[PDB]
Design a protein around this ligand. Structure first.
Ligand code: HEM
Length: 457
């Protein structure tokens, strides 16, 4: 029966804003959820949102006939450069539905067979970089994983090589995109957006859009000119027609999808690999068990697709890192119609909800009371996890289109890492989670000792 929604203390016209004075708002909101429970309202001047934390309420939120994906303010600023790509489109936009129908078969578990060789290509480069470090040296984990995922997505996405392992300063495209992403995030905390002190920012953001558009438009035009087929997504987008309308994507939209895959894919996948390595080095017994499987399964100089599929425990490791620290930590929904949530909380059409995924993943009625512990064995039998309890890829038709890709990629790379090196948390690293569009273990570093096992040929 109808309840008032909990809300943290408001401070006059500042409302709840003083409780979020932080560059780590997700982490700050988990602490409010621990105080207030499965649902709370959070008010800033001019904005209201509800934060959901329990599997019980999230399962309702995930009903697509009642709620649909909302573009949060972050996603609307990212739309300045990612346009109506899949990630920053409303569900009702014709290009959302066209791209979705055209691209889905290109992201399935089956489609992974055709990307695997390109993924091995960048994965071998990463292993060789680490084999070639001298004794005195260490690895900057998120930085190398970001080099890996950007290059993998560039190769599989549109057969372009950013050659990140050949560079101290990334390819201009990558500098621009990271900077554009950075600016989108900085605009959120921007008190007075139109003050002249942000004129250089605006100009730089415009310059970064042109850089990104120019490269991608040039590669699209070059592939149409050359007319040749690759195993890449760009080939699928140029030949693909929506079975609903029978129409292909236009060139501009194809550009946006390409910028989208890179922008949406690379940082979350990078974060996942970094957190996985974090948890392994902090849990040596889990590390040994994963390394044992890697040694037993990956008996070839390079992994085949079928071998990657056999790495069950590595898969469990990844899921358990996603349970604790899902690298896209929140997603936003609006009420399609007036509705009552959980039998107690009335909502009007348009009202916004945010799913706080790390807090969902600590629901003790689902996971047990030990929710903070890293235990991959939670995932030994995935069919036994209750529906909507584990949501690191979002929900329904607006769920992560890259989920198979990200998992295949992380499994492959992690298995290769576990196979070829021993690791040492030589600084006793204290976890520091930076928040942007995604989560990542900032400043995470390790030493790898090579097991001297020969590689790909
Ligand atoms: C560990 C890696 C990843 C995680 C945790 C992650 C998470 C997510 C989440 C939570 C969403 C839903 C966002 C929302 O509701 O607003 C999403 C959507 C999306 N993701 Fe991922 N992602 C990952 C990797 C990737 C990769 C590798 C790609 C592409 C190569 C990708 C492409 C996309 C796209 C295009 C969408 C929009 C789908 C749509 O709305 O139709 N993601 N992802």
């Amino acid at each position: 029966t109808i309840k008032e929604m909990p809300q943290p203390k408001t401070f006059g016209e500042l409302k709840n804003l003083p409780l979020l004075n932080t560059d780590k708002p997700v982490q700050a909101l988990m602490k409010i959820a621990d105080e207030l429970g499965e649902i709370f309202k959070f008010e800033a001047p001019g904005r209201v949102t509800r934060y959901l934390s329990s599997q019980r309420l999230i399962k309702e939120a995930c009903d697509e006939s009642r709620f649909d994906k909302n573009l949060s303010q972050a996603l609307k600023f990212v739309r300045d450069f990612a346009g109506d790509g899949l990630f920053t489109s409303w569900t009702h936009e014709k290009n959302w539905k066209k791209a979705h129908n055209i691209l889905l078969p290109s992201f399935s578990q089956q489609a992974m067979k055709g990307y695997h060789a390109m993924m091995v290509d960048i994965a071998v480069q990463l292993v060789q970089k680490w084999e070639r470090l001298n004794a005195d040296e260490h690895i900057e984990v998120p930085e190398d994983m970001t080099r890996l995922t950007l290059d993998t997505i560039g190769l599989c996405g549109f057969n372009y090589r950013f050659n990140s392992f050949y560079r101290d300063q990334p390819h201009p495209f990558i500098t621009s995109m990271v900077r554009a992403l950075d600016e989108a995030m900085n605009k959120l905390q921007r008190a007075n957006p139109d003050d002249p002190a942000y004129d250089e920012n605006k100009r730089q953001f415009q310059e970064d859009i042109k850089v990104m558009n120019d490269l991608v438009d040039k590669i699209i035009a070059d592939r149409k000119a050359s007319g040749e087929q690759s195993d890449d997504l760009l080939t699928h987008m140029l030949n693909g027609k929506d079975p609903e309308t029978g129409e292909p994507l236009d060139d501009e939209n194809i550009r946006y999808q390409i910028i989208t895959f890179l922008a949406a894919g690379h940082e979350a996948t990078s974060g996942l690999l970094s957190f996985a390595l974090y948890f392994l080095v902090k849990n040596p017994h889990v590390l040994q068990k994963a390394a044992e499987e890697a040694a037993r399964v990956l008996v070839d100089p390079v992994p085949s697709y079928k071998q990657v599929k056999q790495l069950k425990y590595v898969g469990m490791v990844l899921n358990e890192a996603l349970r604790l620290w899902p690298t896209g930590p929140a997603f936003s929904l609006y009420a399609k119609e007036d509705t009552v949530l959980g039998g107690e909380y009335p909502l009007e059409k348009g009202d916004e909800l945010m799913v706080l995924i790390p807090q969902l993943h600590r629901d003790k009625t689902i996971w047990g009371d030990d929710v903070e512990e890293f235990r991959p064995e939670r995932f030994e039998n995935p069919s036994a996890i209750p529906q909507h309890a584990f949501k690191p890829f979002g929900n329904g038709q607006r769920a992560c289109i890259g989920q198979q890709f990200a998992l295949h990629e992380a499994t492959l790379v992690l298995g290769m890492m576990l196979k070829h090196f021993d690791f040492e948390d030589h600084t006793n690293y204290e976890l520091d989670i930076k928040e942007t569009l995604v989560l990542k273990p900032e400043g995470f570093v390790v030493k790898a000792k090579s097991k001297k096992i020969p590689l790909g040929g």
